[PDB]
């Protein structure tokens, strides 16, 4: 039912400096933390109302990881332009997404740690959280460096520990918004479904299937039967 | 381990500056600094990785460090205070996670260097009653009147260092317990069989290595400058 | 947030008498738990690393266990050579790098077994000088404690053990000496409780 996710970007500049590091944290589509490297004194910023109750030590533990990452990701980009024979004169990007999924029960369903270079898949942690998945001969270079540094074991201990403890804690503090399900307001072609939460909805074959778009009130919209979590019974629509 | 720290011993006055040097284990890229004060635990100061500052602990503004492109590290301690007297350790991290420690730098900060004294060394020959009674012979070595606490006592038999049948006090003794600047005394025992003592071809020397001054400051006294030196005492085997 | 607590601070064991050293810790998350052995004034020496709970590492007479809150170092049949201060360190995966937060240590002293005691106080003369002399208490058992004197002009060391390996012989000793000449072997260790069978040569 619930999940946590961190999204990183490490984008190259045209000279010897200075790459930009953005980090963003989510609890099922709801942005809660944001760090941007560009600023005189970059700090991790709250984005959701429920994260504001956290202490100074929490805001500094995050800032230190993200500021170290602003450095650790510069060396990684250089290593990468090195395996791929790229000049300093281009803009190159490393994208990463990691996190945990849990069931209604309260146990970790599966852990994630995925990376991409220049927009496409580069290295990923497997279901057993004990082995890696490489894309090209340059990814097998990263993998060997990771098997040696016991990288998977650290990610597994985090995903099974810290990540589960903090998600359950975030879900508890923000239960009024996170643990609640808003049902879609429907109208009829056109098969509309407005103001629902979460995004996962089924509107029902070769039909006009538009992507799930955000409203700006943390609610969702989309455009036959409307199946959603917030409904105790799947809606039957036809008009006139 | 392979981590090499220098100087192993330093004696300075209050207000002075010292530089501690560290070589990380061959192949390691990271340098960690810890301070171990008397009857206190290892406290984390600062970390460097590949010439760059990373995690920083309780390091004082009076203190600064650097890691050179060759990978070696220099820790600088200025405006020295008595409380700065400690064992400063350097450690380098391995890929699997463990830190390998160097042998440490023992800093002693004194108000004035006037009361720095090398040891006087004497060798006390086995009791003849001990021969008749046990068929064994114990030599005793006294290293007396030294300041500070920086000594290493070793036994040499026939030009070779021995560790078997050797006993050295785990700690020096205060000659004047009440005195804050009290000089120390240290004893050692070398036990060999009566026949080995009875042979006049057998040579016994007690070596005391003292760590004192070394052109670090001037010497305005009538007596000899208490420089880092080896003070010895010997005995040849006695037939009787 | 990061804190390590070891217990007890000092541990006093008899040779062959097994014990457990405790190390409680708190972290945001655990990368690993480290055990180090430190000899007086020397650099901490790496024993083992426990990555997860349930894990077990064993090196000779040392066995290390891990739980979510504690780690134990089990020491089976210790020997005097095992005497050192045992350190515990923790690595946090809720922070950057490989830094370790150390415990204050558990100082272990293993009192040796004295197979054939023959307590005696001997007088020794110097090789160089005539007026300087030491008194040596030796060959006493493990249950004999050497007390210091309340006299500044009388220096009495602690007891320490020597091993004559090639003969299989461990031996206890303490040394005593004095500034001026009126000192004697008969009275050198008077402050101490000495075995009734102590030898005193004339």
């Amino acid at each position: 039912s619930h999940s946590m996710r961190y999204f990183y970007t490490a984008m190259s500049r045209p000279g010897r400096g200075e790459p930009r590091f953005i980090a963003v944290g989510y609890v099922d589509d709801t942005q809660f933390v944001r760090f941007d490297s560009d600023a005189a004194s970059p700090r991790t910023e709250p984005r959701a109302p429920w994260i504001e109750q956290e202490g100074p030590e929490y805001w500094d533990r995050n800032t230190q990881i993200f500021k170290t990452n602003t450095q650790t990701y510069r060396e990684s980009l250089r290593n990468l332009r090195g395996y791929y024979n790229q000049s300093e004169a281009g803009s190159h990007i490393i994208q990463r997404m990691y996190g945990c999924d849990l069931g209604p029960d309260g146990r970790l369903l599966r852990g994630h740690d995925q990376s991409a270079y220049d927009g496409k898949d580069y290295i990923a942690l497997n279901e057993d959280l004990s082995s890696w998945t490489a894309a090209d001969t340059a990814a097998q270079i990263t993998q060997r460096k990771w098997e040696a540094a016991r990288v998977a074991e650290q990610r597994r201990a985090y995903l099974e520990g810290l990540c589960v403890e903090w998600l359950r804690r975030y879900l508890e503090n923000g239960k009024e918004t996170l643990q609640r399900a808003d049902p879609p307001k429907t109208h009829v072609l056109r098969c509309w479904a407005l103001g629902f939460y979460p995004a996962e909805i089924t509107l029902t074959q070769d039909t006009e299937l538009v992507e799930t778009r955000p409203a700006g009130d943390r609610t969702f919209q989309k455009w036959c039967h409307v199946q959603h979590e917030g409904l105790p019974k799947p809606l039957t629509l036809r008009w006139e | 381990s392979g981590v090499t720290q220098t100087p192993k011993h330093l004696i300075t006055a209050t207000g002075q500056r010292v530089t501690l040097r560290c070589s990380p284990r061959s192949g390691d890229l990271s340098v960690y600094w810890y301070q171990q004060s008397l009857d206190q635990g290892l406290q984390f100061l600062i970390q460097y990785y590949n010439g760059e500052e990373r995690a920083k602990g309780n390091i004082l503004e009076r203190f600064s460090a650097q890691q050179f492109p060759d990978l070696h590290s220099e820790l600088n301690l200025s405006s020295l205070e008595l409380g700065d007297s400690a064992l400063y350790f350097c450690a380098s991290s391995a890929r699997s996670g463990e830190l390998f420690f160097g042998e440490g730098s023992r800093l002693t900060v004194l108000e004035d260097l006037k009361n720095v004294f090398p040891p006087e060394v004497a060798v006390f020959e086995p009791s003849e009653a001990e021969i008749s009674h046990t068929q064994k012979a114990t030599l005793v070595c006294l290293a007396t009147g030294f300041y500070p606490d920086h000594v290493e006592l070793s036994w040499w038999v026939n030009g070779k260092e021995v560790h078997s049948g050797v006993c050295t006090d785990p700690q020096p003794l205060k000659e004047q317990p009440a005195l804050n600047d009290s000089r120390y005394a240290l004893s050692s025992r070398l036990r060999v069989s009566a026949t080995f003592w009875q042979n006049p071809r057998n040579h016994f020397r007690c070596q005391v290595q003292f760590y004192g001054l070394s052109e670090n400051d001037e010497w305005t006294q009538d007596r000899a400058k208490p420089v880092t030196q080896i003070v010895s005492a010997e005995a040849w085997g006695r037939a009787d | 947030e990061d804190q390590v607590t070891q217990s007890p601070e000092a541990l006093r064991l008899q040779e062959g008498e097994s014990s457990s050293l405790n190390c409680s810790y708190t972290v945001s998350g655990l990368r690993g738990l480290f055990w180090y052995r430190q000899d007086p004034g020397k650099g901490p020496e790496f024993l083992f690393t426990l990555y997860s709970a349930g894990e077990e590492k064993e090196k000779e007479r040392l066995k290390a266990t891990l739980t979510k809150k504690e780690s134990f170092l089990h020491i089976t049949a210790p020997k005097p050579e095992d005497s050192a201060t045992y350190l515990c360190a923790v690595q946090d995966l809720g922070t950057s790098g490989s830094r370790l937060t150390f415990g204050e240590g558990t100082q272990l002293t293993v009192n040796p077994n004295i197979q054939n005691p023959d307590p005696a106080v001997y007088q020794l003369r110097d090789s160089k000088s005539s007026d300087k002399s030491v008194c040596l208490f030796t060959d006493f058992d493990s249950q004999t404690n050497v007390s210091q004197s309340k006299d500044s002009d009388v220096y009495i060391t602690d007891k320490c053990v020597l091993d004559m390996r090639s003969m299989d012989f461990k031996s206890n000793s303490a040394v005593a000496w004095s500034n001026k000449s009126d000192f004697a072997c008969a009275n050198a260790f008077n402050n101490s409780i000495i075995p009734e069978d102590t030898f005193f040569p004339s």
Partner: peptide, 11 residues
Amino acid sequence: HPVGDADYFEY
């Protein structure tokens, strides 16, 4: 809560 990157964790 994010995961820290230990030493030698680079690409």
